[PDB]
Amino acid sequence: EWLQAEIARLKGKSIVPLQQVKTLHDWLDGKRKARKSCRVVGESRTGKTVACDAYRYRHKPQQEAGRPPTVPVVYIRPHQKCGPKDLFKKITEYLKYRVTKGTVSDFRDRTIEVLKGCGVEMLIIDEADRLKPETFADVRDIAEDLGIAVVLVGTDRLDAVIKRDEQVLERFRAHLRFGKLSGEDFKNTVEMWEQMVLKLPVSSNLKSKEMLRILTSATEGYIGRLDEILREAAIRSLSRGLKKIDKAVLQEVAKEY
Amino acid sequence: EWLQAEIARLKGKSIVPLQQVKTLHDWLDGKRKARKSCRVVGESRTGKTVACDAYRYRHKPQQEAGRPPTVPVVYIRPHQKCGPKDLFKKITEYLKYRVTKGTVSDFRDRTIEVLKGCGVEMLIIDEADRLKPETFADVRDIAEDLGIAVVLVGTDRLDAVIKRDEQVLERFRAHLRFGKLSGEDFKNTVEMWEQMVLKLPVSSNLKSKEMLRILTSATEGYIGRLDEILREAAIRSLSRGLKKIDKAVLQEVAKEY
C-alpha cells in the first residue's frame, strides 16, 4: 500500500544539513585538535542535540585485532542532580567496559584507566546544567589531567549556573551560540524541507508569501517547530487523499499549537 | 527421514573460523615460543573457551614406541574455590598418569616430574578466577621453574582479582581482549552463519536490512547469542515444513529471550 509506505516515512526522523550545523562541526573540530574546552549555548528548540549527534556519527570508534576500540568522541547525557558517582559510571559504560561495585574513588581510578589507552580526544556533555556543583571538580580535573577537550552543551540557565564559580567559568570561557532562523534563512529552509524532506507527489510551493506567513507565525523561527508542523501537515494531508499541503490543512494543524 | 537427518545436525556443535579466533591463535603461538605468560579477558559470551579449544586441537599429543606422550599444550578448568591440592591432581590426570594418595608436597613433587620429560610448553587455565589466592604461589613457581608459558583466561572480574597482588599482576601483565561484534563484522558473520552453518534448502537472506534489525536487537553482538538464536529458528522452522527462516518465526524465537 503506497499510502502506508509514505506515512511510515514522514513519521520518521532525519538530519538536514544546515548552516548552524556545519558551523558547529568546524568549530568543534578546531577545538578538538587544539585540545581546548568550551561551551555551546542556545534556545531550547534550535537543534543543539542533533547537531552534536551529527558530529559524533562522523567519527566512528575504530577497531584493530587486539586492543580496545579507539573512541575519539564520547557523548553522554546526565540524569537530574547528577553526582560524582554517576558520571564515572556513564563514561565507563559508554566505552563498553563493565562497571563493578566499589566506592567513588574506585569509579574514578577506573575511569581514568579506560580513558587512557583508549584514545579519547573529546567529551561532550549534554544538558550540562543537570550536574551538581560538586561534580565540576571532577570534570575540570579530567580536562586538565588528560588531553581531553570537554564541551558543555546547554540553555541560558547554564550560564547562570556556570557564573556562580570562578574556576569553572574560566575553564569554559569560549562559547558558540545557536539562535532562531529569520528572513532569507528561514524561507530557504522551508524550501529545503519541502524538496528535501516532505517530497509529496505534487508539492505545495511553501515559499510563497501566503504560506510563509502561516509558517512564520506558527513557528517563530525554531527549527523544532518547523519540522513538527510540516510533518503533521503532510501526514494529515495524505491520510485525506491529497497530493500537497494546502492552506486550510496547514492552518488546521497550526491552530492546535 | 530427511527432516530428522537435518534436525540432528542443526542441533549440534561446530567451530566457525572468525577473526578473533585467528588472532588469538597467532598471539598465543607467539607467546608459546617465547615462553612468556599472559592473560586473555573478555565479556562472557564472546567465545573465549571455544577459541582456546580450537587452538588445543591443532596441537595433538605425540607418541613414539616407548616414552610418554609429548604434550605441547595442557588445558584445564578449575572447580570453585580451587586449592593447591586440586590443581596438581588435574595436571596429572590430564597427562594420563594415575594419581595416588599423599599430601600436598607429594602431589607437587609428582606434578613437576610428569611436567618434565613429557614436553609441555604451554598451560591454559580457564575460568582463572576460580582459584584461591594461595594457589597463585604454585602457579608462579611453575611458570618460573619450568619453561612453561601459563595463560589465564577469564572475565573482567579476573582483573579485579589479579590486581589485588603485585607479584601476580606482574607475571601476567600482557593481555589480549575479546569483545562484541558490530557494523560490518556482525553483518558478514550473520551471512557466514547462514551459508556456512544453517544451509537450508532455500535460505533466508539474513543480511537484508529487515532481518539484521531483528538479529541486532536480539543478539547485541555476542556470538553466543547469535548462534543460539539462529539455530533455534532454523529447527523450529523445519519442524513446520519450511525451507527458510522468515520474520515471524525469527521474532517468535527472539521474543522468548
Binding site: 520518521g12 526522523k13 532525519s14 538530519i15 538536514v16 544539513p17 549527534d53 551529527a54 556519527y57 566512528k60 570508534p61 575504530q62 577497531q63 576500540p69 573512541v71 529545503m192 528535501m196 524532506v197 | 558490530s182 557494523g183 534489525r213 541486532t216
Partner: peptide, 14 residues
C-alpha cells in the same frame, strides 16, 4: 543536498 536518515546513522554505529 543529501539528507541522513537518523535511524540509519544509528544502525551503522560502531
Amino acid at each position: 543536498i543529501e539528507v541522513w536518515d537518523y535511524e540509519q546513522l544509528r544502525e551503522e554505529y560502531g
